[PDB]
């Protein structure tokens, strides 16, 4: 299958900036501040640290945002509707939601912490805010998340959000970090075309405060890729999926398992899913990687 001259999707997951707060004893909150290299640390008499942001799951995956070929547009709508029927959204929605429910979006601040807690506030929801108390003790594996009282009701939101023409699924995430006395906090930092590290900041009340960026947060929800050859650890979902510790591309075009080679086999995947014999694990792995890049969105053009 050819790539068109116009093909682009919108993202289906929209995180926000993460704001930091300092909770003092007798329970009053103050935005965290820093010095100027920049250095940010917990103040002395502080109890713990709040972190808060929001995530939406908003079904932009079903149709392309822009596509000048009606043959390629009907090829998408068969793929998403057959992935939904044959495989289902249970695997991807579990892997996204586990990065929210542990502290994956708290990058290096989970490091050297006594305990941290996550409280969800889903919007199309009745009551009883979903709590995850004492991660690193209670919520270790996939089975630990499933033993929560309401884990099926929140996975079935993200399933319903992806499986509908208007699915919404807003989460309000709030964390509670118990650090040591005068501990490090590592926020995100700006890109300078040049030790000389500048933080990213907003304004809460009248004071500067470190943030952990909206694009930085979305890169932590989408560390799912482990379907590549060897798959020692999860990789941020992207085309020709890269690692950034080592400047390498796993899923190089020489491997033949990047996203642009799987697009040329997208017509082949429709007859595999429309049969009755269950597909092989390797093929579905390429279907999970196909779907996770349409949730990521992007320009998919050529020429």
């Amino acid at each position: 299958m050819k790539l068109p001259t116009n093909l682009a999707y919108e993202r289906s997951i929209d995180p926000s900036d993460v704001c930091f707060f300092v909770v003092w004893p007798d329970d009053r909150k103050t935005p965290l501040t820093y010095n100027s290299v920049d250095f940010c640390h917990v103040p002395y008499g502080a109890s713990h640290i709040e972190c808060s942001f929001s995530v939406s799951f908003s079904s932009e995956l079903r149709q392309p945002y822009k596509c000048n070929s009606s043959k390629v547009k009907q090829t998408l709508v068969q793929l998403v509707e057959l992935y939904e029927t044959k495989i289902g959204w249970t695997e991807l929605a579990t892997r996204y939601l586990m990065n929210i429910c542990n502290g994956k979006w708290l990058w290096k601040n989970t490091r050297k912490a006594y305990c941290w807690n996550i409280v969800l506030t889903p919007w199309p929801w009745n009551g009883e805010k979903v709590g995850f108390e004492d991660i690193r003790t209670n919520y270790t594996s996939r089975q630990d998340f499933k033993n929560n009282k309401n884990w099926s009701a929140i996975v079935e939101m993200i399933k319903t959000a992806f499986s509908s023409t208007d699915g919404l699924a807003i989460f309000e995430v709030r964390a509670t970090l118990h650090l040591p006395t005068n501990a490090m906090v590592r926020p995100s930092q700006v890109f300078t075309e040049k030790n000389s590290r500048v933080f990213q900041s907003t304004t809460i009340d009248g004071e500067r405060s470190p943030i952990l960026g909206a694009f930085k947060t979305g890169a932590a929800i989408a560390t799912i890729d482990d379907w590549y050859p060897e798959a020692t650890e999860p990789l941020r979902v992207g085309r020709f999926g890269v690692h950034r510790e080592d400047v390498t591309c796993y899923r190089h075009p020489s491997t033949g398992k990047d996203f642009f080679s799987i697009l040329q086999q997208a017509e082949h995947y429709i007859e595999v899913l429309s049969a009755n014999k269950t597909p092989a694990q390797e093929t579905i792995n390429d279907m999970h990687f196909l779907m996770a890049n349409l949730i990521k969105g992007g320009m998919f053009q050529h020429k």
Partner: protein, 374 residues
């Protein structure tokens, strides 16, 4: 994290060791133990904590794509800190290595022993349930092809229960209880496979030669190349019962086959199969590589017989480095100073009798020299 070492055994595999550490230290399974082990390596700032697997199957360092150097640093970190008395865990792992076999087969290494890569089992690991209920662990010999019977119970190994389901001890524990029927597996008696199993285990088995364990697996890979098929236990023991005059009978039949099917004959046109398929099995130590040690014994007393038939066989500069164990830079230097008498590297300009006597002049070693087959 603070752990207790179980009863140590130098023949236990690595996947059987983590099950016994987890069962002694009160964990639920091995999936939980490795996931708690990854949590400890994060807490002491290890560089490759995130590549430490939670799967028992991929634990070995040949499994890791790029975490091979971080995996063995992780294994060396655990044995020094988390135990009351330091165990031996690097000695039970199956590492990759740069050693190649003949002609181009790669290899793996486990402690003081080098295995062929192609004989490593990757689909389903057989087991002996009698050793699982007497010794209490699993051996590393179950991961390699050829080892088909138990060397101490003389019972064939099992890959499938009576209810059609396979039994892998890495996913089903060390007890010997099946997953579907939750029953012990019913067993499924020759002699020729029992001798090789006692020979591959490291004990003296007659008439098979007393070799180190790195070389005993090299003969099994070599015997599969001669018959050009899978390994046969009956013809293998019979071949070494008539050692060395059975191996002399093949080489006579090979040179009579290639002469009939003479100054233009090459080394690859007369002895291309036997010579190049016996150089590195695993190495050139003629004290223990009895195939290359006897082939050079046979070709020494036949150099200038039949008007110098063997000594006039043509060779390249590529296949001169294979015999001399040198590089193309030393070959190009020995055509400058002309210790070796005649550049196109793929050109046939050298004779086998000149390469054989250049080795006796400038390229012997303490292990690859003529003084062992005398």
């Amino acid at each position: 994290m603070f752990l207790q070492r179980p009863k140590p055994y130098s023949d236990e595999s690595l996947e059987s060791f983590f099950i016994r550490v987890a069962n002694k230290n009160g964990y639920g399974d091995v999936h939980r133990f490795l996931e708690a082990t990854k949590r400890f390596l994060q807490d002491i700032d290890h560089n490759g904590y995130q590549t430490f697997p939670t799967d028992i199957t991929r634990i070995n360092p040949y499994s890791a794509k790029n975490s091979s150097s971080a995996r063995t640093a992780s294994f060396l970190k655990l044995a020094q800190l988390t135990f009351n008395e330091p165990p031996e865990l690097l000695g039970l792992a199956i590492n990759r290595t740069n050693m190649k076999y003949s002609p181009s087969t790669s290899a793996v290494v486990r402690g003081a022993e080098v295995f062929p890569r192609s004989l490593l089992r990757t689909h389903s690991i057989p087991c002996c349930p009698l050793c699982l209920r007497e010794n209490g662990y699993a051996s590393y010999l179950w991961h390699f092809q050829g080892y088909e019977y138990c060397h101490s119970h003389n019972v064939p190994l099992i890959t499938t229960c009576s209810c059609g389901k396979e039994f892998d001890y890495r996913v089903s524990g060390l007890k010997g209880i099946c997953c579907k029927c939750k029953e012990p597996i019913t067993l499924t008696g020759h002699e020729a496979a029992c001798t090789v199993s006692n020979w591959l285990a490291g004990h003296e088995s007659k008439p098979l030669p007393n070799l180190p364990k790195s070389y005993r697996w090299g003969l099994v890979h070599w015997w599969m190349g001669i018959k050009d098929s899978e390994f046969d236990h009956f013809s293998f023991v019979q071949f070494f019962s008539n050692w060395p005059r059975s191996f002399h009978s093949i080489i006579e039949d090979e040179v009579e086959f290639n002469l009939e099917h003479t100054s233009e004959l090459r080394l690859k046109d007369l002895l291309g199969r036997l010579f190049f398929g016996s150089i590195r099995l695993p190495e050139r130590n003629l004290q223990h590589n009895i195939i290359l040690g006897e082939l050079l014994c046979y070709l020494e007393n036949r150099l200038w017989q039949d008007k110098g038939l063997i000594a006039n066989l043509k060779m390249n500069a590529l296949e001169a480095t294979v015999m001399l164990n040198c590089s193309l830079d030393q070959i190009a230097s020995m055509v400058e100073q002309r210790i070796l008498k005649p550049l196109d590297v793929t050109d046939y300009l050298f004779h086998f009798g000149d390469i054989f006597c250049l080795w006796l002049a400038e390229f012997q070693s303490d292990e690859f020299n003529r003084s062992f087959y005398v």
